[PDB]
Ligand binder design. Sequence first.
Ligand code: HEM
Ligand SMILES: CC(C)=CCC/C(C)=C/COc1c2ccoc2cc2oc(=O)ccc12
Length: 470
Amino acid sequence: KGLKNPPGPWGWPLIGHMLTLGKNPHLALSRMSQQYGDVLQIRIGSTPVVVLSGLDTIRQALVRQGDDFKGRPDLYTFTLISNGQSMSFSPDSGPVWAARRRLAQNGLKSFSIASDPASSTSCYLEEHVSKEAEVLISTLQELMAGPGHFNPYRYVVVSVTNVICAICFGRRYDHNHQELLSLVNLNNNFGEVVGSGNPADFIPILRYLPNPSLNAFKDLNEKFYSFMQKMVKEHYKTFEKGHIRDITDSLIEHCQEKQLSDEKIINIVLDLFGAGFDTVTTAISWSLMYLVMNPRVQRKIQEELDTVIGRSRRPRLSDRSHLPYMEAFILETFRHSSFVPFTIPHSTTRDTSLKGFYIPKGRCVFVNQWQINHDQKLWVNPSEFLPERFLTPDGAIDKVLSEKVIIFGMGKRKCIGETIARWEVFLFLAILLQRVEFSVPLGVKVDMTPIYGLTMKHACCEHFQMQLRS
Ligand code: HEM
Ligand SMILES: CC(C)=CCC/C(C)=C/COc1c2ccoc2cc2oc(=O)ccc12
């Protein structure tokens, strides 16, 4: 009716609610939204923060009022990413950002969904995922002959990285390549530092005290930026104007057809490479954890594969639409884990209101996806892993209910690799489960508790076993 300020609990005058958030902000703020509602206010240090919950309220802000909520706060941790010029994390939300986003979407679309000039049956993504799925199966058979057990993340992260690495740099790597493992599987705390609520972003003194976490984050980005440099120079040395091989070339080509510094056009590939390998690897890793902890669910997926395709040919993307129980499992992996509990923090571009509450310009905003995916109002038993909740009586996907699983964001800042992620996750699982069975013996600890971060990881598990099927 009128205009109010967003409600919220009392906080300490110097540190605010930093202690209320604790180690699991997504859980603390979910309980908090049950009491104060979909639009609430807190403080981290002296910085106010508005936290958005509820499915309709978040759609109202990110979509219907999207231009008001399309900004990024000028946090310190973001200034360390891509030399302070990250497309996704810098405070630039004007036309320069929109142009870079438009370069990334077309680069992805051109080298993921487009038809491969070599094969006629499949596209780029399906070709790459098929190759790595085979190498992944062979690599796991070797481990079953030796130690008899393995850590799936150790080898999934390479297979997933080779896919995005072929789309970006036209290269793949061996599962024991020392350079790669040092890059994608050596002290990778990117998600832990960038996760919404990092005290270093709101308590300035923590940035200058002995901080091993922040030191690892600085080294990690310097290492990734050097890798970008190496791959761009190697591409320039062998660049052919009429033969665009990957996304790096389509960006070099755009630097010649030349607002956008050379650096801001090139480092876009790094945002795609870093996001492509980290989030899909975590998604496939979480999927494997659920398959092992819910053998009932693993066999029902295999039964559908045998019925709809059989073991006479490998699965294909065209079969995704006809495997509803596979989609129900992927949707419930996203929903139950919500391994992306918050979007990247947002920021208001101008004074605005939301559900009658005033939010001034420059206000930092958290978007709680975990709250949606676990809302008691929307789901029956939110804490249980039940893929059947997305299935109709006739065995089809309930389109209305699947669209209430929020993990890719909304509006102007939504994920640009959503389709790639959904096709890549589907194919890897379809090819593997058709041929192998994953399991873990009784009596071994398997900690399913998520570890907070931008992308929530699980405790590593060395007790995975894989067996061929009958
Ligand atoms: C299961 C896999 C993935 C999930 C759950 C996921 C989720 C998200 C989320 C929550 C956001 C932020 C939304 C917001 O800030 O409002 C985002 C943004 C983004 N995603 Fe994804 N993502 C996934 C995979 C990928 C892949 C495969 C790519 C590229 C190949 C990618 C590229 C990006 C980029 C570049 C952004 C930044 C958008 C911007 O800053 O404007 N992501 N993603
Ligand atoms: C997960 C959600 C919701 C959104 C992510 C979107 C983007 C753009 C992530 C950028 O990802 C990375 C970058 C970017 C420059 O440098 C990087 C270095 C990295 O190193 C790592 O270990 C893991 C990732 C990583």
